[PDB]
Design an enzyme around this catalytic site. Structure first.
Site, PDB file in Angstrom:
ATOM      1  CB  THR D  51       9.871 -11.168 -15.275  1.00  0.00           C
ATOM      2  OG1 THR D  51      10.374 -11.971 -16.344  1.00  0.00           O
ATOM      3  CG2 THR D  51       8.907 -11.973 -14.466  1.00  0.00           C
ATOM      4  CG  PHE D  73       0.716   5.850  -0.105  1.00  0.00           C
ATOM      5  CD1 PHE D  73       0.821   6.646  -1.219  1.00  0.00           C
ATOM      6  CD2 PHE D  73       1.453   6.198   1.022  1.00  0.00           C
ATOM      7  CE1 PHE D  73       1.642   7.754  -1.255  1.00  0.00           C
ATOM      8  CE2 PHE D  73       2.282   7.320   1.006  1.00  0.00           C
ATOM      9  CZ  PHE D  73       2.373   8.098  -0.138  1.00  0.00           C
ATOM     10  NE  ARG D  74      -4.824  -1.038   0.403  1.00  0.00           N
ATOM     11  CZ  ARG D  74      -5.982  -1.701   0.329  1.00  0.00           C
ATOM     12  NH1 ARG D  74      -7.144  -1.071   0.430  1.00  0.00           N
ATOM     13  NH2 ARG D  74      -5.978  -3.013   0.198  1.00  0.00           N
ATOM     14  NE  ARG D  76      -0.465  -5.172  -1.420  1.00  0.00           N
ATOM     15  CZ  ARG D  76      -1.068  -6.358  -1.387  1.00  0.00           C
ATOM     16  NH1 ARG D  76      -1.000  -7.109  -0.273  1.00  0.00           N
ATOM     17  NH2 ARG D  76      -1.809  -6.779  -2.452  1.00  0.00           N
ATOM     18  CB  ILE D  77       4.835  -4.197  -6.216  1.00  0.00           C
ATOM     19  CG1 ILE D  77       4.129  -5.414  -5.634  1.00  0.00           C
ATOM     20  CG2 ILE D  77       6.197  -4.591  -6.819  1.00  0.00           C
ATOM     21  CD1 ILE D  77       4.905  -6.058  -4.506  1.00  0.00           C
ATOM     22  CD  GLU D  82       2.245  11.161   3.054  1.00  0.00           C
ATOM     23  OE1 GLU D  82       2.035   9.965   3.308  1.00  0.00           O
ATOM     24  OE2 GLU D  82       1.344  12.002   3.126  1.00  0.00           O
ATOM     25  CG  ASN D 159       8.928  -2.980 -11.408  1.00  0.00           C
ATOM     26  OD1 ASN D 159       7.883  -3.161 -12.109  1.00  0.00           O
ATOM     27  ND2 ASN D 159       9.327  -3.850 -10.475  1.00  0.00           N
ATOM     28  NE  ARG D 170      -5.677   2.738  -7.526  1.00  0.00           N
ATOM     29  CZ  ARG D 170      -6.488   2.481  -6.484  1.00  0.00           C
ATOM     30  NH1 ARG D 170      -7.808   2.491  -6.625  1.00  0.00           N
ATOM     31  NH2 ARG D 170      -5.969   2.252  -5.273  1.00  0.00           N
TER      32      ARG D 170
END
Ligand code: FAD
Ligand code: FAD
Ligand code: FAD
Ligand code: FAD
Lengths: 214, 212, 218, 214
Positions: D51, D73-74, D76-77, D82, D159, D170
């Site tokens: 955290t 873009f998958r 989400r956080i 674009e 973040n 990735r």
């Protein structure tokens, strides 16, 4: 729980599952097991009016959606939701494409007949697909060959989304300013939402919904 | 509704659930036995957890505010709680909660002193309400062991993360207990996922020795 | 540089910020590169048509000191990051929000307001005393602390983007919110106005759903 | 700081709030010893207390082919903007793989010829698009024939914790090569700005392979 709505030439929105109903919001707001119609309806309206939308998070849908990649891309921008998209890894891939009908161009005054536009779109799509298959046949890996395919290639995905996030989705997409294709999918989503949560949906139309087309 | 009692007055009750182990298989394959079970394992084993976001629970939890406050740190979930501005029970730990620690007064004396301050604080609270003090102010004297209630709507993936953080010896004993009830309901509703989680993904300790 | 005292021992302090009003303009245009009137019009246009994603690219960190009953309302905002003080990395201390008599004048009560203050103070004192007694006796803190009242002060670091901050101001900088939280929200608003003046004014003009920030300067 | 990727792509650093010390302040909840401070960072990372790293934030500017952007873009956080024609000029470039991309694969057709076929398709699709626009077809319809290798641009604010999750998924050999390359560029910038955290991540928390080899 099962509904399917056909969208575009080959697309669809189907309801896979739902958790809860209008009373699930009533229950969560009260932290109770209530099941009195009048006062429950009043509460739903009241929450909606005052923007107290957390209770609506306790209603959840799963959808199975077939849509062109240009639509799926705008769609997947909705972050407060869960997606599983079709990959070769767990089931069979197929290759269909959204060919707009000639009536899609009505209103626009085009240098060539709408039927010809439709046909030109078919043609370039057919060429890209045949190039794709060619590359696959030669042993180009799918992940490379597939980059020649156009944005109207259909994809499929599951979408799990709670009612509150769904209303936000509808505010952005169920609108005459959104692209027609997007609107059409948003009408389908609205329609299922209305079927499964009529009070919430009606309250949303009255007090919270920002668009026109619904 | 499966309902499990925790601490002296607390509980975790299942309100609703959407889906089951197959909801995750359908999602992974994007399509509306031992093969399907094997896919669950394969997913958990390789860290592909997104299919489990398609299973969802709602729970009704009654817990002391100190436990709720830790629980509510789990942001990938939806909460509706009773309002402090608009019943009054308190978690009194048993003498046995203290055994394992050397103390200068006996455990039952600790229990007693906890009960006493609670009584005093509660009575003071009632005097203030009785005097006209609005509740949003009068309640600030109540101790952290006051019981609250909330609904919690959480997908199975976010639930496994919660079990990772709270069903573990390093979390406060009190929240472990709540995490054991959650595990138990999860296991009942989604047996394949649950076993697969313990075997491949669960990072805590207690669930591998405390059954259900 | 920016610290605002709140209640009797509280504060909102600014630890850091990324970006400014122009971080939102740049993001809307997807261009790493200035024209004041045009850039201010874009900010108004984004806010007016409800396109608030560009404001996600401005981010704040705050250090906040507040009673637990306030912190619990605050932590309900999930589109944000929190680090609360624990026994682990840093020293604990034990302070409490004792409301002044002013907090209660306005309410018709059957004892004087000062008497309320006195009674709250007393019970705090007794709870705390019991706590330290249990501590001295060997009871571990995680057990002993459950006797402590909800007006105990805690601290936290809050990292929050401007869009999520605006939602927070919507919900808390409002006379329907508890007065204590209003006061924190006013301090959060003042800082936010100091760093993002254009976005903060556009917020008030087009998107803000509350009462008090339209009443009360900064 | 800008890193070129693929034939016409890049990752550029736009802004950053904080550094390694931002996580240390957060963890200790203190606005107020170099070696003590690294030890805490390793401690947080090895115990999975991630955290504190949410208080370090990056904004990137990324130019990437759509197939890549769709996988990105998958995540989400994070926050995306674009490129739209609504606020800026649009442009039309495409990722053509170099023949080295195939090298490794046994293909019926030489790699340069694969490269050429992809290029041919792009040119044809792009020309069909232009013919449609000239005809008076609106862009929102005409662009649907464009291939998935069309470059797009976006701003990405993320973040450090969410960024580490991204590298986990990735910066790994099982990801498609193209996204790996963007992930390596992200990693480099991460490393530059937050060395202690990056070092601690590789040591304790990173799940992938390629950041330990390059
Ligand atoms: C295209 C269009 O511009 C939008 O990007 C798209 O429709 C999704 O936007 P959204 O954030 O409302 O949807 P979602 O990304 O699903 O957002 C849903 C709701 O959550 C909030 N939200 C989600 N993530 C964040 C974030 N990182 N920061 C601030 N608010 C957030 C939004 O304010 C919105 O009310
Ligand atoms: C108490 C303890 O210190 C934690 O704050 C508490 O357990 C919540 O942790 P969490 O963020 O993992 O849970 P949640 O808040 O439920 O988050 C669970 C998962 O979502 C991710 N997550 C959620 N929000 C964010 C965010 N804003 N930034 C980065 N990652 C996020 C986490 O990486 C984690 O894997
Ligand atoms: C008081 C009130 O009861 C709430 O507890 C408090 O105001 C939190 O509000 P919020 O969810 O808008 O803020 P946050 O919890 O910060 O949410 C801010 C935005 O994010 C969205 N959001 C975040 N998580 C979810 C979710 N799980 N489902 C739907 N929307 C979400 C909200 O729609 C909202 O627009
Ligand atoms: C391709 C691949 O399958 C994923 O779709 C892609 O990598 C997105 O990854 P992510 O969801 O882990 O990252 P993000 O979408 O950025 O999520 C980051 C972290 O947050 C948690 N998270 C975010 N949203 C949810 C949600 N709706 N439910 C449960 N957990 C969530 C995940 O546990 C993950 O560790």
């Amino acid at each position: 729980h099962h509904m399917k709505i056909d969208i575009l030439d080959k697309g669809f929105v189907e309801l896979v599952d739902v958790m809860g109903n209008d009373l699930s919001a009533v229950r969560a707001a009260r932290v109770s097991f209530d099941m009195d119609e009048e006062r429950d309806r009043h509460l739903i309206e009241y929450l909606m009016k005052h923007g107290d939308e957390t209770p609506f998070e306790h209603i959840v849908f799963t959808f199975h959606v077939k849509a062109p990649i240009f639509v799926a891309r705008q769609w997947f921008r909705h972050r407060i939701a869960s997606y599983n998209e079709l990959s070769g890894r767990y089931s069979k891939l197929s290759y269909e494409f959204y060919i707009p009908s000639p009536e899609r161009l009505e209103g626009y005054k085009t240098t060539i007949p709408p039927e010809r536009v439709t046909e030109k779109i078919s043609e370039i799509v057919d060429k890209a697909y045949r190039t794709y298959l060619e590359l696959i046949e030669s042993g180009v890996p799918r992940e490379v060959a597939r980059i020649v395919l156009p944005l109207n290639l259909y994809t499929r995905f599951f979408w799990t989304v709670n009612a509150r996030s769904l209303m936000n989705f509808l505010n952005l997409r169920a609108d005459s300013h959104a692209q027609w294709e997007i609107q059409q999918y948003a009408l389908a989503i609205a329609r299922i939402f209305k079927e499964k949560c009529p009070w919430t949906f009606e309250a949303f139309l009255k007090y919270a919904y920002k668009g026109d087309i619904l």
